[PDB]
Amino acid sequence: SSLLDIIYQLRQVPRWDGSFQFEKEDVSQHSFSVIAISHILCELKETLEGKKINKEKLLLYALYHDVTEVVSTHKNSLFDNLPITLSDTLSTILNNNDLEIQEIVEHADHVDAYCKSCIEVHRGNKDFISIQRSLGDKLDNLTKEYPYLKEFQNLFLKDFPLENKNY
């Protein structure tokens, strides 16, 4: 199985190609943030909409949401010699039809892109100012239709990144 190789190969897939970055990020760093953001968004959505979401399937889907970018950058070798318990879980993630999980991860993906733009602008990267504005405007519109995104915005995105890191 090439599954473990693909997990580490994601470090070789860059993002934001064509734009100058003070910090070049890869898909593994991006997917790490999307997992964490997906879980936070899901907890907020659970309380606001009065529900419980299966966070196992959500976190696993966010974990592999850009796994196809090892081929197409930014499916038969995965299951080779793979046991039935791993192939079933991998098939459920790869052939997901849970629209709510897809929506949360898509929102988390947009939040991460906006966070990346905030960090670059914070570093002094004027080339990301227009990217931050477009991603921020689209995010503001999403907060009008998804209350859990507005809650996330009020909790973290009002001062990001932190002025003084007092942990």
Q: 7: Cβ–Cβ under 8 A, 6 or more apart, which residues?
A: 28
26 is in an annotated binding site: no
Among 13, 14, 21, 55, binds a second copy (CB under 8 A): 55
Could you tell me which residues are beta bridge partners of residue 75? none
Contacting a second copy (CB under 8 A), which of 17, 18, 50, 83? Answer: 83
Q: Is 165 in the site for a second copy (CB under 8 A)?
A: yes
**105 touches 65 (CB < 8 A):** yes
85 binds a second copy (CB under 8 A): yes
Q: DSSP state, 10?
A: G
Q: Name the H helices within 50-159.
A: 55-63, 69-72, 84-94, 99-123, 129-145, 147-152
Binding to Mg ion in span 77-116, by CB under 5 A = 109
Candidate residues 14, 21, 70, 92; the one interacting with a second copy per rule CB under 8 A: 70
* Residue from the set 14, 21, 32, 92 that interacts with a second copy by CB under 8 A: 32
Q: Map tokens 């070798």 to a residue.
A: 77
Euclidean distance between CA atoms 100 and 51, whole angstroms: 12
Nearer to Mg ion by Cβ, of 108 and 121: the residue is 108
Q: Is 59 in the site for a second copy (CB under 8 A)?
A: yes
Q: Write down the least CB distance from residue 3 to a second copy, Å.
A: 7
Interacting residue ranges for a second copy, rule: CB under 8 A: 1-11, 23, 25-26, 28-29, 31-33, 35-37, 39-40, 43-44, 46-47, 54-56, 59-60, 63, 70-71, 75, 77-78, 81-83, 85-86, 89, 115, 119, 151, 155-157, 160-162, 165-167
Residue ranges of the annotated binding site for 4'-phosphooxetanocin A are 15-16, 74
